[PDB]
Design an enzyme around this catalytic site. Sequence first.
Site, PDB file in Angstrom:
ATOM      1  N   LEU A  90       0.902  -1.170   0.138  1.00  0.00           N
ATOM      2  CA  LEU A  90       0.035   0.046   0.061  1.00  0.00           C
ATOM      3  C   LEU A  90       0.963   1.229  -0.110  1.00  0.00           C
ATOM      4  O   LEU A  90       2.034   1.030  -0.183  1.00  0.00           O
ATOM      5  CB  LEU A  90      -0.968   0.072   1.204  1.00  0.00           C
ATOM      6  CG  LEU A  90      -1.955  -1.276   1.253  1.00  0.00           C
ATOM      7  CD1 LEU A  90      -2.664  -1.197   2.487  1.00  0.00           C
ATOM      8  CD2 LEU A  90      -3.058  -1.057   0.009  1.00  0.00           C
ATOM      9  N   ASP A  91       0.209   2.472   0.055  1.00  0.00           N
ATOM     10  CA  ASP A  91       0.978   3.451   0.308  1.00  0.00           C
ATOM     11  C   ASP A  91       0.713   4.595   1.554  1.00  0.00           C
ATOM     12  O   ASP A  91      -0.407   3.772   2.288  1.00  0.00           O
ATOM     13  CB  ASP A  91       0.914   4.493  -1.072  1.00  0.00           C
ATOM     14  CG  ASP A  91      -0.852   4.727  -1.215  1.00  0.00           C
ATOM     15  OD1 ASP A  91      -1.322   5.322  -0.175  1.00  0.00           O
ATOM     16  OD2 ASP A  91      -1.267   4.839  -2.293  1.00  0.00           O
TER      17      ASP A  91
END
Lengths: 115, 115, 209, 115, 176, 85, 155
Positions: F39-40
């Site tokens: 993810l970020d």
Amino acid sequence: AGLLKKTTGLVGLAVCETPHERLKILYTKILDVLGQIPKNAAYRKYTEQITNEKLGMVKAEPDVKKLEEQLQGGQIEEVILQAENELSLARKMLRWKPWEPLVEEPPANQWKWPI
Amino acid sequence: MNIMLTLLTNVTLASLLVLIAFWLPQLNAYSEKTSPYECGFDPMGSARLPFSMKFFLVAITFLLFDLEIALLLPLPWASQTNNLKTMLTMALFLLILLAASLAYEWTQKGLEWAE
Amino acid sequence: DTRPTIRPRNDVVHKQLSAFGQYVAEILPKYVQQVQVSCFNELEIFIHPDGVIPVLTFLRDHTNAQFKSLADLTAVDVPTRQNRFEIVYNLLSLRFNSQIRVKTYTDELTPIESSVTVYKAANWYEREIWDMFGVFFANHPDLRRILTGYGFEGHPFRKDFPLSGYVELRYDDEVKRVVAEPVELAQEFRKFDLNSPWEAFPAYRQPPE
Amino acid sequence: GTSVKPIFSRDMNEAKRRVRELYRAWYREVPNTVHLFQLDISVKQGRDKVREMFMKNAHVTDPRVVDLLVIKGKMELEETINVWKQRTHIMRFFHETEAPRPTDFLSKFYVGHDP
Amino acid sequence: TYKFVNMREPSMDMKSVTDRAAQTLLWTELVRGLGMTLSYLFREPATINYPFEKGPLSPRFRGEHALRRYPSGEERCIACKLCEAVCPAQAITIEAEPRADGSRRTTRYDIDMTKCIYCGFCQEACPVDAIVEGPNFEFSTETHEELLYNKEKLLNNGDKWEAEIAANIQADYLYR
Amino acid sequence: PPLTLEAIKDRVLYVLKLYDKIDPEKLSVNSHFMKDLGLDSLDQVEIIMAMEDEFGFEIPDIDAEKLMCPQEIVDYIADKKDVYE
Amino acid sequence: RGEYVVAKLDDLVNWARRSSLWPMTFGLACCAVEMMHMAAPRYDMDRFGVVFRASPRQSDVMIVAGTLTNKMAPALRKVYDQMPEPRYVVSMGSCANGGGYYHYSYSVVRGCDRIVPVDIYVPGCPPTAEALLYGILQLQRKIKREKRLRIWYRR
Ligand code: SF4
Ligand code: SF4
Ligand code: SF4
């Protein structure tokens, strides 16, 4: 010493029934704060010169109307109003304190406006 | 009879004018012509949330005062009595308390509209 | 008179303005970089950006200045300088019947102490400066766009912003809502290069580099 | 030359910090904004459009700059919250009316001299 | 020289207070306001019966534009583009080309009457009094395109309002 | 009824299921969003929001920074809402 | 004849329309000042049946007087969409017509046409109050030549 003026004309500027002592006490507070200013500052000598003339000026003339005429500051209530500003200016002047040399010489061509 | 016929004719006349109002002019409408009017730009969402006005105190005293006028309404037939002294004393008595209620309502903020 | 067309020039005002210019320069040497009186008797004070608040406060409150009215607050966008924006203050002294000019400099990314504290008039002038040019001001109460439409991109008065803008408006019937589209002028703005290649005023002949 | 005083953030870490809750303040009200403005678009495409706008501004690697977009996004949030932008201003983010401009070189060569 | 607009203190004698009280109860300044509205009712209305009574103008009036021509018949415009160069709104577009006979005029002289500001700067700049603003101001149209005049429509105006434009400049040329 | 660490376990892994850009297979108690599930940071903001709305109470930014794994969410929710077991 | 009956009936409606136009003032710029001079007793717009009435729910024609700035463009469309619609739009001045002086600006739409359909165009900067009176008179003529019933009878 001059009858109490019904109004100062200016809205909000209430008439001071005891203006002589108000000017004397504020002017003494002016030279008070100017004491915390070292001599070298141009602010000290100039403001002292202005106030010292004004202080010996308000004590000499007991009449309000001759004081206002000779002070060249409009109504008397403006004189206390502005002397108050001079007090606040000198106090905050002590914080910034511009006696110090220029903080930074600007870039070469920031000024000089022929394009 | 006579009163109800007049009442009927008025509502039929009014309703007929509505019927020709909404049917004779045919409609070419959409969802933007039915939008609530707010002097141009979009409403923020209102017109049903509590909109508290200030004259609530004097709004409710009107209801109290409207009861005073109900009490003193029968005066035209009250004058046709054989004991006007008692009628006069009582008639002024109701007026006095009506004046007294207004006066006491006046003195304690009362008619003043809340800020 | 021998000059029925030339505007008469006042030297007494020039001397009074010059004397006051030296007066302010000595009072606050910490910010006052240079000061000049123009030919038509107007005084300009060149301060450092950090001196935005102290210098204005002195001019507003000093008994010998009493400049108590901010006429206007604007900036001139000069891209050729390192600090393109050049914030300009114009003050008027009612007691002494004179006007002063206080000008600073600022690049794109630098915040300036909002003069709302000293002059409450600056409040709305500050928003225009930010909206038109993009100069952010710290400590401003409600700094936001004032003139440009909502959700406007860029800063119009910047010299690098095209006059016609990037986006036009149109009522699109498909969405039944006014929409934004890239600009497409029916007739392009015919730019006119009308600068004569002959020198106009030898007085302002900038020396060669 | 290499050093200049900052806006709000002293380096990328706190600048990135001010981005996060700005994204937080942008996530929460999107369903509320959609409800408020009678958005045709559902909630879901509202949320990623906030994400995509935040995403396109990723190459920035300067603390002063990131502060500028952070404060600019705050005004955009402020304009949206207190119904200052109408439906048209909100729909401006969704580029709907304009046709998709193709990205392949062949299509550009077919349509015009656009480089 | 200043004057105090509102520094009137009413007198406290028994006469003045009663008059103020009489003014209060028996509304007098309201009657004075009423009494004067009656005065204007009986007066002479200033309405002019449009369009049977058109308003009064001056020879300097600026209205619909027109290109005039010399008494010989040849147009006055020699395509110096002064009017186009000085037009504040850039409503003038001019294209010139050598005519067949020599002395050359415009091949395109379009005035955008929806972009025009009617400042009159064109008629001042013109060194031959070719482009002028005529006296007409009733050229309202139903479609936007009908406003966008070209050379032909403007030349038609010059051949229509010439009997009026000639007299106007005849009365005003000495002032200029 | 009281609140236990298992209760946090199940509801935390519950709320991660509804997350569209998550994979139910590789999602684990030790799963690291940056490392495991990819993810970020903007993504990580979404879960800690989905955490606070479903849990009800508000979790500030300071703890949403280094908190990274469902262990950390379950441990940190436990102390905030007083789940000592 | 049926056509004759529909002909007189259409004229009655069209007479009732053209003899009562109630502008909804969109006073924007210096074009609005000249329009008020039309309402001034020198020209007396009221005398033609046309009287100023607010609340676009109770108005027939829009009189766009002034520049139309992109910021307020949604407002123009919204107040246009809320009129009970036997409705017409009059554009006053060069700016409202096609941009006028500010045709090339970044925040002025090049004409009010791009937002709303436009009836008779009134040129000027500003058009004199007499010129607007001619414009409103032109709309009355346009309303007179409406064949709404004849078209319905021949549908
Ligand atoms: S009057 Fe109209 S056409 Fe003539 S210069 Fe002015 S704007 Fe241009
Ligand atoms: S100023 Fe007169 S002569 Fe010159 S181009 Fe215009 S119309 Fe022709
Ligand atoms: S056309 Fe002229 S008068 Fe009318 S709004 Fe524009 S600038 Fe003002």
